[PDB]
Amino acid sequence: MKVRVDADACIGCGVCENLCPDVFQLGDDGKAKVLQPETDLPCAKDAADSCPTGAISVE
Ligand code: SF4
């Protein structure tokens, strides 16, 4: 799966990191960072579905 994040939609809540720490990390600038742009981890989808602003897209 291709994982991307739209910085403009990201509010820096950190829910994606809570759910899938190996794929997402809340950076110091208060924005999510995608550690695994291409991943097979099922949690990437879960984090996307839980993002409050839909900033994460998993294809
Ligand atoms: S869950 Fe969404 S809004 Fe919250 S830090 Fe992750 S990408 Fe940003």
From Swiss-Prot:
Keywords: 4Fe-4S, Disulfide bond, Electron transport, Iron, Iron-sulfur, Metal-binding, Repeat, Transport. InterPro entries: 3Fe4S_ferredoxin, 4Fe4S_Fe-S-bd, 4Fe4S_Fe_S_CS, Fe-S_cluster_ET. It holds the Pfam family Fer4_15. Disulfide bonds join 20-43. Its cofactor is [4Fe-4S] cluster. [4Fe-4S] cluster binds at residues 10, 13, 16, 51. Residues 2-29, 30-59 form the 4Fe-4S ferredoxin-type domain. Binds 1 [4Fe-4S] cluster. GO terms for molecular function: 4 iron, 4 sulfur cluster binding; electron transfer activity; iron ion binding. The keyword 4Fe-4S applies. The keyword Repeat applies. It comes from the Bacteria. Ferredoxins are iron-sulfur proteins that transfer electrons in a wide variety of metabolic reactions. Monomer. This is Ferredoxin. It comes from Thermotoga maritima (strain ATCC 43589 / DSM 3109 / JCM 10099 / NBRC 100826 / MSB8).
